[PDB]
Amino acid sequence: MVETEPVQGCRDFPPEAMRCRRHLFDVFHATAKTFGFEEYDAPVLESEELYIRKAGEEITEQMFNFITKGGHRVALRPEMTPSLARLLLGKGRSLLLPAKWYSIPQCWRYERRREHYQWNMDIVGVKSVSAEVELVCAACWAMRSLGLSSKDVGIKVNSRKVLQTVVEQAGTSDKFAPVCVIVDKMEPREEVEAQLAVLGTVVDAITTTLSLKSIDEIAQRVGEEHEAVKELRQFFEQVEAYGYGDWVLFDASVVRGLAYYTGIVFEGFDREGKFRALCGGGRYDNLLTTYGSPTPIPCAGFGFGDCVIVELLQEKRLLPDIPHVVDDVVIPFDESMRPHALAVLRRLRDAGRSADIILDKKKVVQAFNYADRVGAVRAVLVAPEEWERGEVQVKMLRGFAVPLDRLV
Amino acid sequence: MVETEPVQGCRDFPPEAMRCRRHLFDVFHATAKTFGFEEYDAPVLESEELYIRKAGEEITEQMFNFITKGGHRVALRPEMTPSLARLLLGKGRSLLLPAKWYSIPQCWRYERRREHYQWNMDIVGVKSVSAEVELVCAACWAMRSLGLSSKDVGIKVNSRKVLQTVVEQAGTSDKFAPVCVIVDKMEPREEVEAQLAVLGTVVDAITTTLSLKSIDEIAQRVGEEHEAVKELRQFFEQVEAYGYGDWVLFDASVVRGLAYYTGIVFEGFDREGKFRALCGGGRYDNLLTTYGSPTPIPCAGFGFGDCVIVELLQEKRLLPDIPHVVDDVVIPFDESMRPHALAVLRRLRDAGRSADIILDKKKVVQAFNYADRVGAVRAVLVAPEEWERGEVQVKMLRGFAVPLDRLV
Numbered sequence: 001m002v003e004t005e006p007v008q009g010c011r012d013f014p015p016e017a018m019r020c021r022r023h024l025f026d027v028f029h030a031t032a033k034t035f036g037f038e039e040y041d042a043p044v045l046e047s048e049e050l051y052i053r054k055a056g057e058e059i060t061e062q063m064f065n066f067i068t069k070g071g072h073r074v075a076l077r078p079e080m081t082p083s084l085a086r087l088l089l090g091k092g093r094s095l096l097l098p099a100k101w102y103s104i105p106q107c108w109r110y111e112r113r114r115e116h117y118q119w120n121m122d123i124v125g126v127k128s129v130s131a132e133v134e135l136v137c138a139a140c141w142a143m144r145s146l147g148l149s150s151k152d153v154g155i156k157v158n159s160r161k162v163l164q165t166v167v168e169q170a171g172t173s174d175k176f177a178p179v180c181v182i183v184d185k186m187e188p189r190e191e192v193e194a195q196l197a198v199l200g201t202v203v204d205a206i207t208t209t210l211s212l213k214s215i216d217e218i219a220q221r222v223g224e225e226h227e228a229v230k231e232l233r234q235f236f237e238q239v240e241a242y243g244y245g246d247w248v249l250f251d252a253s254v255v256r257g258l259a260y261y262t263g264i265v266f267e268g269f270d271r272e273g274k275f276r277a278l279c280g281g282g283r284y285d286n287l288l289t290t291y292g293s294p295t296p297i298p299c300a301g302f303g304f305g306d307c308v309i310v311e312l313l314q315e316k317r318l319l320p321d322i323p324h325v326v327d328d329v330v331i332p333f334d335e336s337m338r339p340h341a342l343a344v345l346r347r348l349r350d351a352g353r354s355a356d357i358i359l360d361k362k363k364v365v366q367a368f369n370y371a372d373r374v375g376a377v378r379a380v381l382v383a384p385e386e387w388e389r390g391e392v393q394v395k396m397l398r399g400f401a402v403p404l405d406r407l408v
Numbered sequence: 409m410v411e412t413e414p415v416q417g418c419r420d421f422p423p424e425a426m427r428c429r430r431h432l433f434d435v436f437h438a439t440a441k442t443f444g445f446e447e448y449d450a451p452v453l454e455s456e457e458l459y460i461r462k463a464g465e466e467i468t469e470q471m472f473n474f475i476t477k478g479g480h481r482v483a484l485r486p487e488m489t490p491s492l493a494r495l496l497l498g499k500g501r502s503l504l505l506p507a508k509w510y511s512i513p514q515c516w517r518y519e520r521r522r523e524h525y526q527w528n529m530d531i532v533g534v535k536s537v538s539a540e541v542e543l544v545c546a547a548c549w550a551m552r553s554l555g556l557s558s559k560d561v562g563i564k565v566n567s568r569k570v571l572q573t574v575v576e577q578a579g580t581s582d583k584f585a586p587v588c589v590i591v592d593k594m595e596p597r598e599e600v601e602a603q604l605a606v607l608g609t610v611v612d613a614i615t616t617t618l619s620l621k622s623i624d625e626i627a628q629r630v631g632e633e634h635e636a637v638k639e640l641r642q643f644f645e646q647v648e649a650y651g652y653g654d655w656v657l658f659d660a661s662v663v664r665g666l667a668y669y670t671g672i673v674f675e676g677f678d679r680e681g682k683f684r685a686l687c688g689g690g691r692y693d694n695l696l697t698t699y700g701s702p703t704p705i706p707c708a709g710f711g712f713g714d715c716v717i718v719e720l721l722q723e724k725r726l727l728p729d730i731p732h733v734v735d736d737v738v739i740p741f742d743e744s745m746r747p748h749a750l751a752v753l754r755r756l757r758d759a760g761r762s763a764d765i766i767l768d769k770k771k772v773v774q775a776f777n778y779a780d781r782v783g784a785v786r787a788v789l790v791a792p793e794e795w796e797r798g799e800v801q802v803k804m805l806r807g808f809a810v811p812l813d814r815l816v
């Protein structure tokens with residue numbers, strides 16, 4: 001007998017589980033459309049070269065890679081952002097900016113779960129913090145659409161520019177990304193301190209700034225007109241004006257684990273402190289330059305996974321099982337009525353209704369039970385006596401003779 | 409500079425191409441919902457064991473497989489049906505039958521294109537040809553929804569039971585699947601004859617039956633009540649009653665390339681003879697038994713690829729480029745108006761409209777051009793003078809002061 005379990009670390013989505021996923025994805029798509037983003041996609045299989053960043057990232061450490069028979073280094077994508085950039089770089093001057101692009105790719109890792117889906121939202125060609133404002137509002141909107149409130153979740157926001165200063169002022173920029181990657185692990189002090197020491201006083205200044213509790217305190221240490229300060233202030237003013245001020249807050253400890261973030265960074269969290277980050281992202285104004293773009297392309301975006309949000313929605317009782325539904329179930333009284341019932345099935349579907357016909361041979365009561373089990377709104381019985389009168393029998397599930405034309 | 413081209417044999421879907429794909433997929437989903445099918449999914453990565461069928465199929469010959477670091481034999485799925493069966497077998501007695509399940513998986517091959525998406529539709533637990541009738545009507549419905557008519561396309565239908573008789577009557581059933589696989593290649597007689605000879609008179613009887621031009625001729629060679637004859641007659645009567653008689657026809661040469669088909673088989677084709685099969689499928693009543701099910705589970709279904717249909721739709725001029733659209737573009741008169749414009753953006757989106765706000769700093773005329781480029785129905789200018797009167801300026805793209813409450 002074949003193994004019924006899926007491959008290690010991978011999920012099956014039979015109809016029940018698929019409905020839950022579709023509930024979530026419908027929100028990702030609806031939110032993207034509400035915010036004017038355009039859908040895109042790219043292959044799950046990409047060249048391994050795309051992810052060679054040399055900053056010790058967890059994402060590139062845990063890569064699901066292999067070699068083709070042709071001897072090429074490939075990987076199932078651990079994230080989408082490099083694929084986006086490849087696509088953007090491929091378009092070059094032909095791409096109208098600004099561009100707002102989204103996708104919901106399955107991404108992969110190897111080490112526990114080995115795959116997840118991850119809603120991606122990115123804004124390309126916008127220098128100002130309005131990009132990050134929109135991105136954060138979009139994540140909040142998705143969560144609000146799922147039934148969560150600002151009492152359940154928030155988005156913590158910071159800028160890597162603050163720390164950038166401090167790293168630079170201690171005397172080599174090529175260690176900044178590695179530094180962010182390390183400092184990302186902060187929530188074991190002994191471990192993180194030691195990691196920085198391996199990378200080559202400045203550790204104390206890093207730790208201090210991370211623990212600064214407000215923007216005013218940041219301004220005291222970098223002036224009220226440091227790059228980060230004006231941008232964060234503008235960011236918060238704009239989110240407030242959009243009406244999502246209760247969802248967002250400053251946290252100097254947020255850097256994210258990815259090498260390529262240059263500016264504002266953010267992550268979503270549950271206000272009970274029970275789950276990992278709901279989503280995360282930021283600005284990455286240099287990535288396209290590192291890929292070989294002749295002109296710097298400003299970019300910002302986030303990823304929003306399909307696992308943590310579901311855990312949280314389950315905890316909050318916001319994922320009721322919503323059963324399957326169909327508008328009509330057409331029941332032939334017996335097999336002699338099947339051709340007639342097919343003609344009725346056609347009419348109903350032509351009118352835009354979802355409809356089944358009883359496919360096997362079964363008695364009316366068992367047909368009706370079937371209708372109830374599949375969540376039919378209406379059972380339509382096609383019987384000899386009614387048919388002669390140009391009618392069927394209709395019965396609402398959530399009896400009466402009805403003429404054919406009046407069914408729709 | 410990074411390679412901008414996707415990995416060999418794989419497609420990128422920037423927004424333009426993604427719109428075309430979504431046009432198609434929307435039809436696959438809409439048709440599935442109209443026909444009462446339930447969505448499911450499973451991992452693209454499956455155990456290689458799932459596809460070890462030993463019948464010389466092209467599908468298993470051209471498999472995109474590899475070995476994990478853990479030393480397990482895995483593959484990116486070449487088709488979905490084995491994954492379905494694994495899922496069905498895993499559920500066992502807990503699954504309500506009949507079940508109608510669909511998916512739109514990306515499937516893979518290695519040899520030219522290496523991936524495609526393939527709409528899958530399967531009906532489980534229905535012994536009678538009503539299953540095949542519904543499946544074929546669903547494929548026709550999808551094609552009609554895409555703008556094609558019965559003058560553009562048809563579905564050729566046959567039963568492997570006819571040939572089964574002839575193979576059996578020549579004296580070993582374990583060669584039947586291999587025989588179908590070979591005979592599938594018929595449209596080079598020298599090649600096909602020779603292939604059968606390698607497998608071990610009976611070749612002449614096989615070729616003759618394949619060339620029988622009608623069901624009446626089949627009935628002459630197997631009697632008017634052979635299994636296949638009554639089932640094909642019933643099949644055609646039912647499709648006729650549903651109103652799709654002009655879409656379907658008998659063709660004794662259709663066997664399909666897959667080992668597991670036992671009964672009716674079918675494939676879609678363009679009536680100009682320009683393209684490969686649009687779709688294909690049939691009944692496979694024994695697959696679940698070969699996987700170890702203690703009770704035989706009747707099954708039928710088809711796959712419908714995303715490549716040939718697009719070629720045909722392009723030929724027929726049925727794939728116009730449909731540009732991006734958004735309902736509103738909100739334009740701050742200048743940066744002082746950005747907070748106010750964000751409040752307006754919120755209102756519009758709250759009402760279910762799709763809306764952008766100009767994110768960068770730009771003059772009104774360039775903002776308006778942007779609005780036109782992204783396919784805005786309406787431009788909403790948020791200016792100082794109007795705002796004081798509790799209004800914005802609205803202008804339809806496909807000017808006037810409008811009070812805030814009246815925008816939605």
Ligand SMILES: N[C@@H](Cc1c[nH]c[nH+]1)C(=O)O
Nearest residue numbers: 079081281282301302303
């Ligand atoms: N790729 C990032 C999220 C992101 C998308 N765009 C920008 N950032 C991640 O996986 O966490």
Ligand SMILES: N[C@@H](Cc1c[nH]c[nH+]1)C(=O)O
Nearest residue numbers: 487489689690709710711
């Ligand atoms: N798996 C078959 C189609 C199919 C789905 N269900 C039954 N048949 C193919 O790839 O051609």
Ligand SMILES: NCc1cccc(Br)c1
Nearest residue numbers: 107108109113114115116
């Ligand atoms: N934490 C990032 C990640 C990346 C790919 C797959 C999974 Br599951 C998780």
Ligand SMILES: NCc1cccc(Br)c1
Nearest residue numbers: 515516517521522523524
């Ligand atoms: N012809 C079957 C097939 C299977 C997987 C991928 C492609 Br492209 C084609």
